[PDB]
Amino acid sequence: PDSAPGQAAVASAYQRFEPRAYLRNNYAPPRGDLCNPNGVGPWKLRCLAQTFATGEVSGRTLIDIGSGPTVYQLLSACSHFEDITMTDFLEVNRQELGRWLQEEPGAFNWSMYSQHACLIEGKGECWQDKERQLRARVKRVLPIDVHQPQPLGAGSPAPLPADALVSAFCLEAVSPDLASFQRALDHITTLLRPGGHLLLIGALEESWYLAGEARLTVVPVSEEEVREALVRSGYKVRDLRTYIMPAHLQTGVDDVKGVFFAWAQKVG
């Protein structure tokens, strides 16, 4: 059928996306409490740490798809890639990342996340060093639209194809229905070299979340649907794990039932 209408709806909804509210909702306590090892925060970081610790995900360039105003998803990644590209649809998010990159006081504080990352990586690294290296290795912050066949546009900056892709809470959050999800996945897959790796994190069975005034509509997806999409796009699924959201972390910022983590390798 037609993809344009659904996309138009999504673009419109995101015009009201408030980064600060989003940050507060998902990365300040209770959800941003990294002290309880059973929490979603530590689980996400652990998934990323453990994956990179295999040494099997490495290369020169990495692209983060739909970064929004967050960097946690790159904390463990940055020691394995010399060149990192962050991306987002919204200017306001790219500016938010801009604040952090200039190490401004007005910037969101990720130090709890950096420290926890250092803690679990177990190399005795101090968090200031981890942050310094991430800031060094982020070579650009670019506009992206995953609904386009060329999500970064034509003749874009990013070194293509990338050795690896990271994406957290983007695809299912910007896709009206499963078919759109699949196409978005196909689009970003063109950015990844054959044999390259994708680390995908996302919400399970979620239909809405809040970003301030904006209450955005999300395609609820299951683990099996995520698996099948990955196979459909030419990936071998190396890892796919599920975190079930504890009642006490279900706070009304959304209706998320769980979180998935996928480590997939593009077939080459």
Residues annotated in a binding site for S-adenosyl-L-methionine: 22, 27, 66-67, 72, 88, 93, 145-146, 168
Q: Does 119 bind its own copies (CB under 8 A)?
A: yes
Residue, CB closest to ligand SAH = 68
User: What residue numbers does the annotated binding site cover?
Assistant: 22, 27, 66-67, 72, 88, 93, 145-146, 168, 206, 254
Nearest distance, CB of residue 40 and ligand VGD, angstroms: 4
Cα torsion 164, 169, 170, 171: sign:
positive
Q: Report the DSSP beta bridge partners of residue 258.
A: 204, 244
C-alpha 52/C-alpha 192 separation (Å) is: 17
C-alpha 127/C-alpha 111 separation (Å) is: 7
Here the tokens at position 136 are 């060094």
Site residues, ligand VGD (CB under 6 A):
26, 31, 40, 169, 173, 203, 209, 245, 249, 254, 256, 259
Alpha carbon 246 to chain centroid distance? 21
| 3-state DSSP assignment of residue 227 | helix
Please choose, from the candidates 70, 64, 65, the residue with its C-alpha nearest in 3D space to the C-alpha of residue 28. 70
Nearer to its own copies, 125 or 205 (CB): 125
Q: Does 206 bind ligand SAH (CB under 6 A)?
A: no
Nearest distance, CB of residue 72 and its own copies, angstroms: 15
C-alpha 43/C-alpha 39 separation (Å) is: 6
Q: Which amino acid is at 101?
A: L
Please report which helix (H) or strand (E) contains residue 198, including its range: strand 192-204
Convert 102-122 to b/e letters by CB count within 10 Å (16 or more is b). eeeeebbebebbbbbbbbbbe
Out of 49, 57, 77, 144, the only residue in the binding site for ligand SAH (CB under 6 A) is 144
Site for ligand SAH in 64-123 (CB under 6 A): 66-68, 70, 73, 88-90, 93
Q: Which does 209 bind (CB under 5 to 8 A by kind): ligand VGD, its own copies, ligand SAH, none?
A: ligand VGD
Q: Which does 88 bind (CB under 5 to 8 A by kind): its own copies, ligand SAH, ligand VGD, none?
A: ligand SAH
Nearer to ligand SAH, 70 or 233 (CB): 70
Nearer to ligand SAH, 123 or 189 (CB): 189
Q: Torsion-angle region of residue 55: left (phi > 0), alpha (psi -120 to 50) or beta? A: left
C-alpha 223/C-alpha 262 separation (Å) is: 9
Nearer to its own copies, 42 or 202 (CB): 42
Which positions touch its own copies (CB under 8 A)? 34-35, 37, 115-116, 118-120, 122, 124-129
Which positions touch ligand SAH (CB under 6 A)? 14, 17, 26, 66-68, 70, 73, 88-90, 93, 144-147, 168-170, 173-174
